[model samples]
Target chain A: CTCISISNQPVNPRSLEKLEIIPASQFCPRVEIIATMKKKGEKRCLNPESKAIKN
Target chain B: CTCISISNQPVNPRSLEKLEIIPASQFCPRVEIIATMKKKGEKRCLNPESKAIKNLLKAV
Candidate 1:
């Protein structure tokens, strides 16, 4: 339940947000990403917010 | 300097935050989240206390 978005905010704020996203959906607008993330361990929380894993 | 901050921990934590085991509320003792907050190119100071984002309860 994120009330606001930080993607374009001049000052990004940390959040306690819960956003449900289905892969490649516009309802959840895309955020420009430059860094490729990799998880060192298991995905404990977050549907996809944590570091990404390479296959 | 951070007391301790390690990424990729398998903890079901808010994990990277300044604190953990935050209560529902205690007059919002308030957590200081940033060593310094960033705005555009500005570095702002942060308040570090205890932050538990449950019920997202804000002590207003």
Candidate 2:
């Protein structure tokens, strides 16, 4: 299950990216961010404290 | 930079995944979907017609 969200953080130095959205009705208040690498194609859920969230 | 989107793509079977979002105002109309991997930590942008977007559902 990929319930990933990048929040408002920048994947690069300058550039706000698009948000991958799921329907609001199906929204999970306590969701995890899945981080995948471009090469290995490996993915994992981001910790609640991950700065990647800009939370 | 990481205009990454998984579409309605299920990162796994029977499950939907979330997208790594930047913002709408800074959205790239000509942008590519940045696909990242785990081990090699590789990253690249997907083309315009990459079914990844499931039809470029821009900035929702």
Candidate 3:
């Protein structure tokens, strides 16, 4: 299975709200680390058109 | 394999400097859609912590 679970507490805690979370697999059909290089030859994932997160 | 390919020409067509692209699976280890509610009783995916694009991916 390509599905996993996510807890709502990190995003919200004070109120016991039930979060309608979407699965990772379904959420990122295509996830990638986009590297960038601008003037002065600096490189990074400056903008998140795809993603740059690990957790 | 949960692997795929990405072409670099779209982001930059003016240069053939060879773009360094990273794979999707390696990039987002934990992908998820987040939801938020406001005082006006309105709900929205205010910020894209994971994604908000199908090609840009987000929803909750």
Candidate 4:
């Protein structure tokens, strides 16, 4: 459903391990994406008020 | 329909340049706009595979 799905291999954060599974850790991808974008100061227009301003 | 309607204005890839125009690309837009929700998670409510044992087209 996402074009980036090809380029992006579903981000995975490692340090403690365990947040790399589907369903149980599915939300990781979204969190990682947002975290990376913010770290790089990327102005991702995720969602104006509903999602964009979320964090 | 997605709850995040306008939030996601639709994605376009460089390889999928054909999806930028119409007809070839229009499928995406038209699908998004006209493709109303149906045949979804609540499938049994709409129809039951557990109930159907006959071929719909050749059903007597």
Candidate 4 chain B minimal-lDDT segment of 10 residues: B15-24
Full candidate order by TM-score, most accurate first: 2, 1, 3, 4
> Where is model 1 more than 4 Å wrong at Cα?
A1-45, A48-55, B2-32, B35-39, B50-60
Each model's C-alpha lDDT? 0.24, 0.40, 0.26, 0.19
TM-score per prediction, in order, is 0.18, 0.29, 0.16, 0.12
lDDT of 1 by residue, A3-36 (tens): 2322322211122211212122234343221111
Residue A41 of model 2 has an lDDT of 49
Clashing pairs in 1: B31-B49, B31-B50, B32-B47, B32-B48, B32-B49
In terms of DockQ, the best-performing candidate is 2
* Alpha-carbon interface RMSD for all candidates, in angstroms: 11.3, 4.5, 16.2, 18.7
User: In candidate 1, what are the lDDT values of residues B1-60, reduced to their tens digit?
Assistant: 322342321222221121222112333344322221112322222233324332221210
On residues B1-60, what C-alpha lDDT tens digit does candidate 2 reach at each position?
444543443232113333344332333445545444332544444454555454433322
Clashes found in each candidate (C-alpha, N, C closer than 3 A)? 5, 14, 8, 1
Residues B1-60, model 3: lDDT tens digits = 112322221211111111222222333443322222222332222222322223222321
Worst 10 residues of 2 chain B by lDDT: B10-19
* Tens digit of per-residue lDDT, candidate 4, span B1-60: 222232222221111111100111222322111111222311111111222311210121
- Chain B of model 2: TM-score? 0.35
Q: Write the per-residue lDDT of candidate 4 for residues A1-55, one digit (tens) a residue.
A: 1213222233222211111101112323331212122134422212212332222
Docking class of 2: acceptable
